[PDB]
Structures are given as C-alpha cells and as structure tokens.
Amino acid sequence: ILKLYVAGNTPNSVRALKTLKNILEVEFQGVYALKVIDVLKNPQLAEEDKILATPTLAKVLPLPVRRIIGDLSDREKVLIGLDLLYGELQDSDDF
Amino acid sequence: MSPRKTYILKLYVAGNTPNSVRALKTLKNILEVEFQGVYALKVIDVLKNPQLAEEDKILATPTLAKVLPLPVRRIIGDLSDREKVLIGLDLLYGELQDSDDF
Amino acid sequence: MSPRKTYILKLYVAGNTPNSVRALKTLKNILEVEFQGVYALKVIDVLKNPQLAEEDKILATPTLAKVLPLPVRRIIGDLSDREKVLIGLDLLYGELQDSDDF
Amino acid sequence: MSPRKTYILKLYVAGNTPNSVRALKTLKNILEVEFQGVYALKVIDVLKNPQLAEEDKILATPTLAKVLPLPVRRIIGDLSDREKVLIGLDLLYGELQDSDDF
C-alpha cells in the first residue's frame, strides 16, 4: 500500500490521484494499494505511521507511478511525503 | 560554546495558530534558559513549504515521548491536543551542515 | 506488541566480518546510548537465512541513509563503501529485538 | 499498450550454485517461449554486488507470487525451497528495446 501525505487537495491533484488509483488498479492487483491523507484535515500522526521524503522512496517506485509522484511533488506542489510500510497481504497479521 | 554534540529537535507543524506561536516561543524559551546548550529547536511548517528535504523525515508523537523531559512533554502533548497543529517530529545529533543556527 | 517499542533499523549483511562485526558493535552501542528507546539495530546475514519473511523487505542503502542520524550514517556509510558487506536496509515500527522479535 | 510496455521480473539471488543456474536458464526459456514481449527476466546476484542500486528494492516471495504464472511460481518455489538461493523478487515495468537507459 502506497501511503501519500498531502497538504490540501486541488483539481489537478485529485485528477492525478485518481489516475494513480487507476494505474495500481490496472496493473497491480494485490501488490499495490493507495492511502492518501490530507494534512490539512488530519495533521496528527498516530502509532506506526510516519512520513519519509519524496526522493527517498520515489526512486525505488514504478516509473509511471514515479512520473505521477514527481508531478504531484513538483508541478502541483501538494505532496509533502510518502510512506510504504506496507504490511501488505489480504489477511491481517498485526496489523 | 559549547556543551557540543547538540540534540536537534525538529518539530513539524501545519500552520501557526495565534496561541501556537506563543507556545512555540515558550518552548524555545525554556529550552534556552533551563536546558542551555544541550538542545536546539528547529521549527518546520509543512504549509509554508510542503516538499520535504531529502534528509528530513517525520516520526510519530507517541514515539519520542519517553526520551525528552516532562516540561516539554506537556508542551508536545499540548501541541498535539489543544491545537491540532503538530504532525510529528524528529531528533538528530549532527551536524552535517553548517551556517544553520548561531 | 508489548514491549511496544521501537523503530527498528534492519541491516542486511552478506557474511560476518571482523571489521563488520566491530562496526555493528559500535553502531548498536551508539543506538542504545544516545537514541535509547528510538532506534533498535537488527542484523541479518543473508548467508544464514536468504529467504525474506512475508513482512520483511530490503530497501537500498542510499535510500534511507539520508534520513538517518550522522553518527549512524557514517558507520553504515563505510559499511557500504569502505568494506563492502552491507546489502540493503529498512526501518519499521515495533515490535522488539534482541529479546528479541519472537 | 502505447505502443509497448514490458514486464521486468527481477530475481534477487544469493550466489550462483551449479544447479540453480539451469533452473534460471529454464525459467528464462519458458519466459521466452510461452510468453514473449512481456516477461523480461533480470537476475541480480547479491553476492557479486552487495550494494543494491538506488532503484532496487527486494520484496517477499509470496507478495509478488500473487500475480505470477503457475510454471514460473513452480520454479520460484523450487529456487526458494530447494537450495535457499532466492532472497526475493521485484516487478518493474518499462519499454526496454531498445532502451539501455532503463
């Protein structure tokens, strides 16, 4: 699950995020999910959650996801950071 | 100049409420007069510039809630509670860069 | 869960080496003196157990290095550059170590 | 597909024994005969170059085995359960011919 942390939502931002959702939906079944949270509505980080810098995890991501992320972080200037924990599977462990 | 090997307490906030700023100046003040030298408060607002630096990261507030002393415990728990402004924080030893704060 | 803490720094290593084990000793010490209750240090020799568990992952070293404290960054740094033995690394929350993880 | 977008199955492998290379050769072969223009196999021996590139990550086996073909999964089941050689795997996407840039 790709966790995005954003500062507010704009039209272009929402469009690009729905596009990102669409891509993880088209070519990433059960291997990539998306959780976007707005820091303008939810600043309080809780428990295991954390925020890493964009160039930290972007370089290791798929390149269309890389171009979408790069867009969000450079053009729209709304993405503050991301996190990929991810504790991924279909059946809960900890979690 | 110096106790040296200073702790760098980076706080990550979203906006500056009229009361939040005074709480900040308070925190800074007590860190200066009561913990002279050992600390260094670095305030970072996400809203002023969203894009985090490559060296920056944000940890949860319940973490780093056993390390720091109590008089700033209350201020941190507050900056999380009364005003929903505090996202998270980080604590670094350094120093990698210079000319930052004299 | 409990003992609840802390942020665990997993180091992925290709074989045990005198210099490497000395450096890891040092790193563990630093982590348990300054950043006690903040950073744990977990070594994994890939030569002993190459198979990653379902939860584990290996991010590249120059990925999470940058966001780590300088005293750790230098050790990991030479651990990759000076005497090349370090594979990737990772940073997770929970759950214990040494105790250790079971 | 505009006009071509190819899969890049990266296998993170701990050393190269005698009898694992024939299974990799075979896997490669079936990746080229049944499928084609899709599954591009890239094998990274972590023992020849411990230093993971910044573009590289290593994930758990089943986590990506979710989307893999049955014969391929039989072969990775082999490499992981038979001789402890497969550390992990990663799946990238790209138009690779001709594109050394990657």
Separation CA D13–CA C51 (nearest Å): 10
Which string of b and e fits D14-51 if b means at least 16 CB within 10 Å? bbeeeebeebbeebeebbeeeeeeebbbebbebbeebb
d(CA B68, CA B35): 11
Per DSSP bridges, beta strands D39-45 and C39-45 are unpaired
Three-class secondary structure of residue B77 per DSSP: helix
Residues of chain B found within 8 Å of residue A81, distances taken between Cβ atoms: 52, 57-58
Element (H, E) at C87: strand C86-92
The DSSP symbol for D59 reads B
Around Cβ B41, how many Cβ atoms within 10 Å? 18
Residue D52: what are its φ and ψ, rounded to 5°? -65, 135
The CATH number of whichever domain residue A94 belongs to comes to 3.40.30.10
Contact criterion met (CB below 8 Å) for D52 and C60: yes
Greatest alpha-carbon span in chain B: 36
Which domain covers residue C17, as residue numbers? 1-102
CA distances from A30 to A91, D56, D64 (A): 11, 20, 9
According to DSSP, the β-strands at B86-92 and B8-13 are antiparallel
Scanning D1-98, the segments in alpha helix (DSSP H) are: 21-33, 61-65, 70-82
**D48 close contact with C: CB closer than 8 A:** no
CA distance, residue A57 to nearest chain C CA (Å): 7
Q: Which of C67, C75, C90, C92 to mutate to test the interface with B (most CBs of B within 10 A)?
A: C67
Shortest Cα distance, chain D CAs vs residue C62, angstroms: 6
| Interchain contact D56–A (C-beta under 8 A) | yes
Question: In chain B, what residues touch C66 (CB-CB under 8 Å)?
Answer: 54-55
Q: Answer yes or no: do D93 and A63 touch at CB < 8 A.
A: yes
Whether C61 and C29 have beta carbons less than 8 Å apart is answered as no
Helices vs strands, H then E, count in chain A:
3, 4
Contact indicator for A54, B53 with CB cutoff of 8 Å: no
What is the DSSP track for C5-63?
A: --EEEEEEESS--HHHHHHHHHHHHHHHHTSTTTEEEEEEETTT-----SS--EE-HHH
Of A59, D15, D52, the residue nearest C87 (C-alpha): D52
Question: At B50, is the secondary structure helix, strand, or coil?
Answer: coil
How many CB atoms are closer than 10 A to CB A8? Answer: 13
- CA angle B8/B9/B14 to nearest 5° reads 135
Domain count, chain A: 1
The C-alpha atoms of residue B36 and residue A67 are separated, in whole angstroms, by 46
- Tell me the C-alpha distance between A4 and A80, whole Å: 8
Task: Count residue pairs from A and C with Cβ separation < 8 A.
Answer: 26
Tokens of residue B13, six digits: 């906030």
Closest CA to C82 of D44, D51, D14: D51
Tell me, what amino acid is at C12? Y
Contact indicator for D89, D12 with CB cutoff of 8 Å:
yes
Distance from CA of C69 to the nearest CA of B (A): 6
CA distance C98 to C102: 9
Q: Please tell me the total number of residues recorded for chain D in this structure.
A: 102
Radius of gyration of chain D (CA): 13
CA distances from D78 to B81, C47, D21, D67 (A): 54, 18, 12, 17
Cα–Cα distances (Å) from C95 to A47, A83, C3, C32, C72, in that order, read 12, 18, 7, 16, 21
Nearest Cα neighbor of B88 from B6, B19, B20, B9 is B9
Residue-wise over C3-16: b if at least 16 C-beta within 10 A, else e? eebbbbbbbbbbee
Angle between helices B70-81 and B18-33 (to 10 degrees): 170
